[PDB]
Each structure stands twice: as structure tokens, then as C-alpha cells.
Design an enzyme around this catalytic site. Structure first.
Site, PDB file in Angstrom:
ATOM      1  N   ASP A  63      -4.424 -14.050   8.523  1.00  0.00           N
ATOM      2  CA  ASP A  63      -3.092 -13.700   8.991  1.00  0.00           C
ATOM      3  C   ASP A  63      -2.488 -13.365  10.364  1.00  0.00           C
ATOM      4  O   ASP A  63      -2.666 -12.270  10.657  1.00  0.00           O
ATOM      5  CB  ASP A  63      -2.289 -12.650   7.870  1.00  0.00           C
ATOM      6  CG  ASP A  63      -0.864 -12.317   8.015  1.00  0.00           C
ATOM      7  OD1 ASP A  63      -0.087 -13.474   8.372  1.00  0.00           O
ATOM      8  OD2 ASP A  63      -0.604 -11.324   7.728  1.00  0.00           O
ATOM      9  N   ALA A  66      -6.740  -7.170   8.710  1.00  0.00           N
ATOM     10  CA  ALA A  66      -6.584  -6.416   7.555  1.00  0.00           C
ATOM     11  C   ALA A  66      -5.706  -5.131   7.184  1.00  0.00           C
ATOM     12  O   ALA A  66      -5.226  -4.890   6.227  1.00  0.00           O
ATOM     13  CB  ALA A  66      -8.048  -5.923   7.094  1.00  0.00           C
ATOM     14  N   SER A  82      -2.647  -4.063   2.743  1.00  0.00           N
ATOM     15  CA  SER A  82      -2.017  -4.667   1.525  1.00  0.00           C
ATOM     16  C   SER A  82      -2.914  -5.956   1.110  1.00  0.00           C
ATOM     17  O   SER A  82      -3.296  -5.960  -0.196  1.00  0.00           O
ATOM     18  CB  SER A  82      -0.602  -5.391   2.182  1.00  0.00           C
ATOM     19  OG  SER A  82      -0.162  -4.574   3.106  1.00  0.00           O
ATOM     20  N   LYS A  83      -3.260  -7.035   1.803  1.00  0.00           N
ATOM     21  CA  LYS A  83      -4.017  -8.054   1.325  1.00  0.00           C
ATOM     22  C   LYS A  83      -5.530  -7.944   0.846  1.00  0.00           C
ATOM     23  O   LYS A  83      -6.042  -8.421  -0.129  1.00  0.00           O
ATOM     24  CB  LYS A  83      -3.987  -9.144   2.668  1.00  0.00           C
ATOM     25  CG  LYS A  83      -2.611  -9.273   3.312  1.00  0.00           C
ATOM     26  CD  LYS A  83      -2.238 -10.775   3.486  1.00  0.00           C
ATOM     27  CE  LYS A  83      -1.093 -10.859   4.704  1.00  0.00           C
ATOM     28  NZ  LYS A  83      -1.933 -10.165   5.707  1.00  0.00           N
ATOM     29  N   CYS A  97       3.990 -14.637   9.722  1.00  0.00           N
ATOM     30  CA  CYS A  97       5.332 -14.116   9.779  1.00  0.00           C
ATOM     31  C   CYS A  97       6.411 -14.939  10.260  1.00  0.00           C
ATOM     32  O   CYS A  97       7.496 -14.277  10.257  1.00  0.00           O
ATOM     33  CB  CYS A  97       5.404 -12.814   9.868  1.00  0.00           C
ATOM     34  SG  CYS A  97       5.101 -11.526   8.716  1.00  0.00           S
TER      35      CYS A  97
END
Length: 455
Positions: free
Chosen positions: A175, A107, A111-112, A228
């Protein structure tokens, strides 16, 4: 800077030159509006004076292309975030997916998380886990700035969740820490320590991360895997693996209608493999899966997590606080319920209740107040979140007076309200809660944030 092995194998995975080009040019400033605080249209109206050109982001109606030191950033009306981080979140809620209990595995810096919160309209609940301790405090500041209340924080090694908290979430956003190949535009030396061996083990990590996630995903739920990086080992190979491990349980959910143009990045599986030069931005991978079936159990509840340091507030008292808060401009949904530890008074999202005792929490919901004598010291964090501005005891500052607040100094109004406790807005947004003292309005902006420079 790019290692030979890496380029001369990006060459063999292109569906190219433009990419080398876009690789070598810096990223566009990118901004996301926080609709928990302001609508898009209102935002556009409000910042028209600043004369920025803003290109719309195709996968985020709330996204656009000294930032942090602008009023609007300080009152939490926008997030400085890159367009690529927007994509995973958008996937997560694609096709009216409306998950009520969501985990964000990595986290920080927020941002997300903040974006998910806004998309759930601050309802339900989120577990925002971050592995590094230092990054947690960044996460929290960022959450508190946007006036998010449905978030709890953990500090765990991501891999733990699968076993610790079985079919708990109806959505997860994984992510994954990757080789950061997509991020050479933000950092011209990003990869430098890049190696195929070093990648094989990063992918090993990404395996057990996604397995853990899958395990902690309730049947029916969506899981979004994003990196990424741009190779297949860390991306497609990781999703394809998951499907091999649980062949009758995993469904890929194609992302091709996600936005107009999505096709340009569409993989045969339904992933978006976003090369930087496709939409002019970072290099990124997004995969969306659904668990269609329960999968076998793990052992592995080893960590017995001991006493929870808070207790739910009793009804007689809970009522009297609700009314005491309302009387100062603070209000909460039925999404939130009052707990207590010491003089301390917290609101937690009901969504999170079911997790209490299955994980040690770093923090939960918002600190509403600390009791002091018969009274209460309302927390800045709660004012940002619960303060309704459209009020008859709000007080709008002039820009001059706003700057003073943020430099952490007292304000002296010509008006000079009647309230002994004054809800202070700028641009009609809750900015802090101040005491009267005659003519003065005492600064109660937490010092850890008192702006140092220009505004």
C-alpha cells in the site's frame, strides 16, 4: 480544497459531479470485527444494546459503516478502520488465496496487518514493516490489542526487501505512499502541496517499491498494490510499468468478481479504481498481480545482519513452561515455538524462522513472560492473545468492575474466586491477569494504556 491543475485533469479521467460532491462531504464512521476474538453474528448480538445503524461493507463480511472508549474496542473485538483500507486485504485473500508467509510493507498504524492476521486465523507468519519509528509503537500497541501472535516487525525503507530477502513471501501487500487524493474526505486540506512534478517523483518511489516487493515475492505468489490516490501516474502507470519490466513474469488478476458491484470500479486490466462516490467512501486504487516465473537475481546482500539475540528454548524447559502457562489459562498452537533472551521468554511463529538473519527485526511474535526467581511475570500482551476465557478459573467482571480495571484500579468481587492468579474476562474476553491478594484482585493493566476518561 483542490488545485486547478488537479480538478481540470480529474475531469479528463472520469468514466463526475457526484464526485466533487462526495469529495466534499466527510467520511462515514467505519468498523471492522476481529474474528480472532468473536464471530460477526456474536458481535452483532453483543452490541445490539448500543443502537447503531450498521451498513454492511460489500467487500468485507467483517466490515460495517466515542468509539475508541467502548469496552469492545478495549478488548480488541473491533478495529476502527476505513472501508477503503479493507479492500487491499480482501483482494489479497480473494478466490481462496491462503498465503502462509505475508509481508505488509507500510503496516502502520496496523489496520491492514491486524486484518490479514485474522484472515490467516493467526496461523503462518507476517512481516509488518514500517518506515517511521514513531509509527512502529502505534503498530505494536494495535497488534497487542487484538491478540495477534503471528507478526514480526521491521523498520526499513521498503526498497530494501527485494534484494535482502528474494523469493521469500507467498503474498505481499504494498500500500504505497502516494499523493493522498482519495483522502480529502478525512482531511479537507490533504493534498495542498500537490503538484504533477511532486507526483512524478512519488511515482518514481512507487516504482522501486513495487520492484522491491516483486523481487521479494516467491514465484506463484500474489502481490497487491494499492494507493489512496486517484490519478493514473501513481496507479495504473505503476502496475503497467512492472509488467513492462518483467513481461513474462507478471500476471494481472482481475478483481471484477471480488464482490457484488465490483464491476462498477473495474478497469480493463482488472484493477479496481475506486472513486469515492462509487460506493460512498474514500478514493482508492487496488491491483492484484501474480508472479508466474522466477525473475533474475539482484546482487545486493550488503547489510550482513550479525547476531540474533535470541535462542530457541530447549525441550526439557519448553515443556515445563507450556505446562506452567497452561496452569494459568495461556495456550498456544503448534504455530508457535518458545525462544529466550534474558529472563525474557518469547513465542515466535515458525513461519518467521526462515527470515532470521536476513533482516534485523524490531520485534517478533509475543513476549510470553519474564522469569523471576522460580516464577514468571506473564505479560499482558500474551494474556490478550493466549488466554482461553471459556474456562473453569475465568472470572467475569460486572460492567462497573470492568470500568475500574480500565481506569487501572483494583477490583473487589462479591464472588471472590479461589485462584491466587485469576483470569479476568469481560463479555467473556480475556482482559488481564491479576493476583488474588486476599479479597482484592490487583490491577495489572499496563499503565501506558490506563484509560483517562469516560466509558
Amino acid at each position: 480544497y483542490f488545485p486547478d491543475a488537479f480538478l481540470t485533469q480529474m475531469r479528463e479521467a472520469m468514466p463526475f459531479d457526484d464526485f466533487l460532491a462526495a469529495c466534499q462531504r466527510p467520511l462515514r464512521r467505519s468498523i471492522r470485527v476481529n474474528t480472532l476474538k468473536i464471530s460477526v453474528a456474536d458481535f452483532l448480538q453483543l452490541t445490539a444494546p448500543y443502537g447503531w445503524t450498521l451498513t454492511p461493507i460489500p467487500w468485507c463480511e467483517e466490515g460495517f459503516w466515542p468509539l475508541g472508549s467502548t469496552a469492545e474496542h478495549l478488548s480488541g473485538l473491533f478495529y476502527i478502520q476505513e472501508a477503503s483500507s479493507m479492500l487491499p486485504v480482501a483482494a489479497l485473500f480473494a478466490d481462496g488465496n491462503a498465503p502462509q508467509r505475508v509481508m505488509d510493507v507500510a503496516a502502520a498504524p496496523g489496520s491492514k496487518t491486524t486484518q490479514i492476521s485474522a484472515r490467516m486465523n493467526n496461523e503462518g507468519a507476517i512481516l509488518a514493516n514500517e518506515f517511521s519509528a514513531s509509527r512502529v509503537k502505534v503498530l505494536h500497541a494495535n497488534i497487542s490489542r487484538c491478540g495477534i501472535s503471528n507478526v514480526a516487525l521491521t523498520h526499513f525503507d521498503g526498497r530494501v526487501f527485494g534484494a535482502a530477502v528474494p523469493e521469500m513471501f507467498d503474498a505481499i501487500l504494498l500500500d504505497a505512499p502516494c499523493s493522498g487524493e482519495g483522502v480529502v474526505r478525512k482531511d479537507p486540506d490533504a493534498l495542498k502541496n500537490w503538484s504533477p512534478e511532486s507526483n512524478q517523483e512519488i511515482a518514481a518511489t512507487q516504482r522501486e517499491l513495487i520492484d522491491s516487493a516483486f523481487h521479494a515475492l516467491r514465484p506463484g505468489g500474489t502481490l497487491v498494490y494499492s494507493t489512496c490516490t486517484l490519478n493514473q501516474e501513481e496507479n495504473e502507470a505503476v502496475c503497467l510499468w512492472l509488467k513492462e519490466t518483467y513481461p513474462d513474469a507478471v500476471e494481472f488478476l482481475p478483481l471484477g468478481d471480488l464482490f457484488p458491484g465490483a464491476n462498477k470500479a473495474l478497469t480493463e486490466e482488472g484493477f479496481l479504481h475506486v472513486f469515492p462516490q462509487i460506493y460512498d467512501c474514500e478514493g482508492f486504487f487496488v491491483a492484484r498481480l501474480r508472479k508466474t516465473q522466477a525473475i533474475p537475481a539482484l546482487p545486493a546482500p550488503k547489510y550482513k545482519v550479525g547476531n540474533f539475540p535470541f535462542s530457541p528454548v530447549k525441550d526439557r524447559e519448553a515443556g515445563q513452561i507450556r505446562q506452567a502457562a497452561t496452569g494459568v489459562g495461556l495456550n498456544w498452537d503448534e504455530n508457535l515455538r518458545l525462544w529466550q533472551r534474558d529472563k525474557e521468554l518469547w513465542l515466535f511463529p515458525v513461519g518467521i524462522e526462515a527470515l532470521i538473519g536476513k533482516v534485523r527485526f524490531s520485534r517478533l511474535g509475543i513476549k510470553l513472560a519474564e522469569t523471576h526467581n522460580k516464577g514468571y511475570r506473564w505479560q499482558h500482551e500474551a494474556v490478550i492473545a493466549l488466554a482461553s476465557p471459556d474456562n473453569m478459573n475465568a472470572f467475569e467482571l460486572t460492567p462497573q468492575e470492568a470500568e475500574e480495571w480500565y481506569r487501572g484500579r483494583d477490583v473487589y468481587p462479591q464472588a471472590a474466586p479461589v485462584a491466587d492468579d485469576v483470569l479476568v474476562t469481560f463479555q467473556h474476553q480475556p482482559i488481564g491477569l491479576a493476583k488474588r491478594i486476599g479479597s482484592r484482585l490487583k490491577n495489572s493493566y499496563p499503565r501506558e494504556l490506563v484509560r483517562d476518561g469516560k466509558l
